[PDB]
Assembly symmetry: D4
Homo-oligomer: 133 residues x 8
DNA sequence: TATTCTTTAAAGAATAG
DNA sequence: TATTCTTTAAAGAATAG
DNA sequence: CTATTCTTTAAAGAATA
DNA sequence: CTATTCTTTAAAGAATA
């Protein structure tokens, strides 16, 4: 299980970034809004990752801060939320803003994000409100 | 997911090439006609790759140009076309020639390729014509 | 199959340790009581490992001594004893103490460990007593 | 797919050898009789490999010569012959001796090897005689 | 797919009833509270059923009224609600009472039933309120 | 495999009909337009059936004439056409009209049916035109 | 799920009996020692059954008394005890004798039965002793 | 498991026969040559059957004599011999003739049958010669 | 005509055309 | 008593005890 | 406004809380 | 001499030969 990658940025093409380590280039998926913090190509960068394995595919997701990775891992455990939707949420709201919205049940703050329906937002609040404690 | 490999060419035995990186040798499958561009053994080379995972096997395909990899990925999504047949198409025609043939429905230009039947060419045109747009 | 890792300690957060080798950081799970022997962060360390693969996840376990790894591999073959429970046993008792307890059938020595029920301890003795010989 | 490994011999414990490359130690299974050719521990060695993937396990097999690897790959395709039995055959007979025995149908030359039954030897000759041509 | 069974009652051992049709005896699972309506053994009875198939098992559930079967089928589509739990709900509340409780969000009316947790009751209301 | 059912009609609730045979009531799915031919409830009826089995469900489909069943079986072999869609086609057009439309490539005659898109109709013509011969 | 069968005995060929009901003949497996109680062929008989389903096969087991069926169902839940082995136990010992032996730990009373090993008998006692209560 | 069917013949369309029992019509597959012995439609008939189950399909095969069913069951256990091929063999040769040919290794007697290749015939003799004893 | 070789869903419910 | 958390075959046919 | 795309995938046991 | 361990795990389609 790859926990962190450090290497040279070869190419930047949202949502994918390519990092080279010892001649091996790794395809990393990243949130659209965190992409702005990556250095210019040819510079070294560091990214925290989570490794996903499926019967037909293997994928690697990256984040600029451990806080982001923690919230991502928690989201994907909620039924009906997969990696694509999870990245969308992190693109729309910062991790701290999301926690506040769930505790306050600001349904409208979630429904405005792309791809999230009314039923989905209700389900998220019901499930997530119990884990932050 | 390995996106690119850079290393020393150890052996060339069409259709397989062996690249060494840090003492690990990777088996790579490549189109017969792109094989002519690889440098002489012992020289460094760069190859773009796509990683395929199946219940009983893992395989790594390589291409000399991003254009080739893009068309390959699109072909394998078509039902009834797998990596073996896809490499044949890329061996027979250049990527640009293939696009022209599909848009023009030059059925004969495709059927002449080895391993492609009349029904197969009909299916390819019907599916691919809608994706290039 | 990864048999041993040698690298720099990046972070220590029981039960997980992060080792960096050539820019790749590996997540390793270790027994709570062996964690005390790891050097201070930034120093080099060596850990013997066992690689577990499942349909939905891949995991890497580490141990400070080959003796521990051998007993771990034997435990996980016993029905009902999974990697999580196996690490608990190794946390509570040294490998040598465990062997003695099984041969003597000291049921109380096992039942006192966290997460182990009376039925579980009975099952362990019945299965393990035949393998040490 | 790992095709070749080059590294330092860390430990030799038949049938397993441990090779270190860049701080990662790889477990490699090898034929009992080819093991005698490996250098002394601490020296560099080269081994040709084949990578086996299964739903519950991943394994890496190694051979000193490309000839051995080729015959191994052919054997494991025969129904009822698995990697364990395949290594036994390569331990008892050299690749050249095996070919001669099959073409001559020297049933006794095969049955004398450990773990091979009369039915198994008959099946091997029937299947293998057609592939060498 | 068996939709209805008509036959002679052979044995009654809650939660299972045994019905014989042409020499074949079918094991049927039923709600604990609907069991009281079944006639005396040896009499003919009619039961509406739903057929469940899994990789390792096949099961046949029965109900006295089409209303019950309809609500059962809807319950089992909710994530985390298995047939075992679904039968418990139908044992505790009538179909009409359940509908009212969901629309009114009377959380306490659900949590009192055996096996139903607070989180489960919240989940049920959120999912079911949209289907009726 | 149940090939035909003969019994008493118990209930008629499109698209499902319930037939009783010896105290067992079978749920049968039928085309919306063939439902008009079924006798009044309480009368005996005959229906030709096809039995579908899946990992999670078993289903039984019925038709008034062998011609209908034959075309249904051929449709479901085409990739992307499920039993639900197949019943829709048989509801919109008679079996004879469908054959004529495919041979003539009357794309508009198909696209007007509910649930069938332009791409779907193109795929159907390409695949079906070869089987009627 | 078939719970009971009543019909005419067509054939008796231990361990299989064939019962006809309405023109359908069902294959039933029965314990070797209960087979002696079945009436002469052509007479009616009653047998309690348990239905077993697997990915590749379906099987139907029968017993003369509910007591036997209950113990059979309990046995097959024990890990390592297959239906074949469970029928052997019921052939060697009556249900009542088995209960007495387990509670008394009369290991020799079990090991003497065909196909039962020492390890198996130990496992059986450990698991079954807790369920009769 | 349906072992025998008795009922009225509804339709005869090689290789399928349709038998009605209590209003349920069963599709039965039979050898081309045994089909000649079936009575005229509307008469009662008896057929011995074997029930095959797969993840995607259920099928029922029938034979006029227990001898045929016994040989069929044995053939399908041989690797590479499917039910389709097994019915072909029984169409070409009587059960008694087949046994004689295997014991004598009359390769030509088998290769002449449709669908059977030289490699297949060799494999059959090797496997079947050991079971009749 | 035999040969060996490949290639592997449907629904729902959200947003586009 | 509810909670969340884990853990996942059978056969054959060769060889030991 | 209707079609097209996409994407996502069990429950019971027996401990402990 | 009889028990214990182990180890291994589809077929049809439609091309081409």
């Amino acid at each position: 299980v790859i926990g962190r990658l450090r290497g040279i940025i070869l190419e930047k093409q949202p949502p994918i970034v390519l990092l080279e380590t010892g001649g091996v280039g790794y395809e990393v998926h990243m949130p659209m809004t965190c992409f702005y913090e990556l250095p210019e190509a040819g510079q070294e960068a560091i990214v925290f990752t989570h490794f996903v394995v499926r019967e037909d595919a293997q994928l690697l997701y990256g984040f600029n801060n451990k806080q982001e990775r923690t919230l991502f891992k928690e989201l994907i455990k909620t039924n009906g939320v997969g990696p694509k939707l999870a990245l969308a949420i992190l693109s729309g709201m910062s991790a701290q803003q999301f926690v506040n919205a769930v505790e306050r049940e600001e349904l409208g703050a979630l429904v405005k994000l792309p791809g999230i329906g009314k039923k989905t937002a209700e389900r998220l609040i019901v499930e997530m409100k119990d884990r932050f404690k």
